[PDB]
Design a protein around this ligand. Structure first.
Ligand SMILES: CC(C)(C)c1ccc(CC2([NH3+])CCN(c3ncnc4[nH]ccc34)CC2)cc1
Lengths: 10, 317
């Protein structure tokens, strides 16, 4: 499982 | 020139803020692609212009079987469109959520393909910066393809540095959580986290609170399962070494230190790229239009001058 991650960039 | 109406819009593969991704069929040829469709007004409003433009430039100057290939880039007045090759097999995130944990041999298959790709990219002076199960897909033949190149840095050769705090929280190298600049070693940390997810069935460090998740990546030491092979434990301890200069592939040779580790003793690096290896898993698709390796969440739905100068594109292949 484990939830879907999201890319960031400051 | 190419237009939105050269395509049949068959199935929805993804959807988010910045747009949708649709399986499509070029009408004039029969050949199926994934189309990334993005709203220009949302891209511009959320400062994601450079990334989109980088993604097109990168995708334009790369040629490798384990990197996704751009056929068409084009825009309308309100949209940007990338027509790339379709990954029938879905994301590794999908497969690993189902199986929970792969065998060392299978992990090793995928690990080699990622390594060959990062080798290629590093040879092109590109640092990928976003290795995750979501960005790792499987083609019809069972091979890996890296998708999503928005976060890349270009023109980083040897020991060049970067400053942008970017990527994915769970997957961040310790040195990127320290102030100031960082090098291409970060990609190997990335490989260390996906191999670990593939072999130990969980993320090496995790906390929903991001403050804690970062305290973990910096301070905590990885644990390994007891019956994980010694050469696997060795590989992982080497890739998830916190100090980049001491990390495997962090030296001056880069990918070669990772290729010459004894986890990969059986792998012929000449013939990984040439694709002579029977993959350990073939996606089991009936038709070309079958999306059983993407989520019902998306697939069950039916369907509808300066800034973008270096974007439009037609592939010669
Ligand atoms: C909403 C936006 C931001 C547009 C988005 C949605 C989904 C994804 C994840 C994918 N792994 C990559 C694109 N795609 C693909 N599916 C199949 N073959 C593909 N080839 C290239 C991309 C792609 C869906 C899954 C990434 C971005």
């Amino acid at each position: 499982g484990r939830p879907r991650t999201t890319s960031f960039a400051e | 020139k190419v237009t939105m109406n050269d395509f049949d819009y068959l199935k929805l593969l993804g959807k988010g803020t910045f747009g949708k991704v649709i399986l499509v069929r070029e009408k004039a040829t029969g050949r199926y692609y994934a189309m990334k469709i993005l709203r220009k007004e949302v891209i511009i409003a959320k400062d994601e212009v450079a990334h989109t433009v980088t993604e097109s430039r990168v995708l334009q100057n790369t040629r490798h079987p384990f990197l996704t290939a751009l056929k068409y880039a084009f825009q309308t007045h309100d949209r940007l469109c990338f027509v790339m090759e379709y990954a029938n097999g879905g994301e590794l995130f999908f497969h690993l959520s189902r199986e929970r944990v792969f065998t060392e041999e299978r992990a090793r298959f995928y690990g080699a393909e990622i390594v060959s790709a990062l080798e290629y990219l590093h040879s092109r002076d590109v640092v990928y910066r976003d290795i995750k199960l979501e960005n790792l897909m499987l083609d019809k033949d069972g091979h890996i393809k890296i998708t999503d190149f928005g976060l890349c840095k270009e023109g980083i050769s040897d020991g060049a540095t970067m400053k942008t705090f970017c990527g994915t929280p769970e997957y961040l190298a310790p040195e990127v959580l320290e102030d100031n600049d960082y090098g291409r070693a970060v990609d190997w940390w990335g490989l260390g986290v996906v191999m670990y997810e593939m072999m130990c069935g969980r993320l090496p460090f995790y906390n929903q609170d991001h403050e804690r998740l970062f305290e973990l990546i910096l301070m905590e030491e990885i644990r390994f399962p007891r019956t994980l092979s010694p050469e696997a434990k060795s590989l992982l301890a080497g890739l998830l070494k916190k100090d980049p200069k001491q990390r495997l592939g962090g030296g001056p040779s880069d990918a070669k230190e990772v290729m010459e580790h004894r986890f990969f003793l059986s792998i012929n690096w000449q013939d990984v790229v040439q694709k002579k290896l029977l993959p350990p898993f073939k996606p089991q698709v009936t038709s070309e239009v079958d999306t059983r390796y993407f989520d019902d969440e998306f697939t069950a739905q039916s369907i509808t001058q300066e800034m973008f100068e270096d974007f439009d594109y037609i592939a010669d292949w």
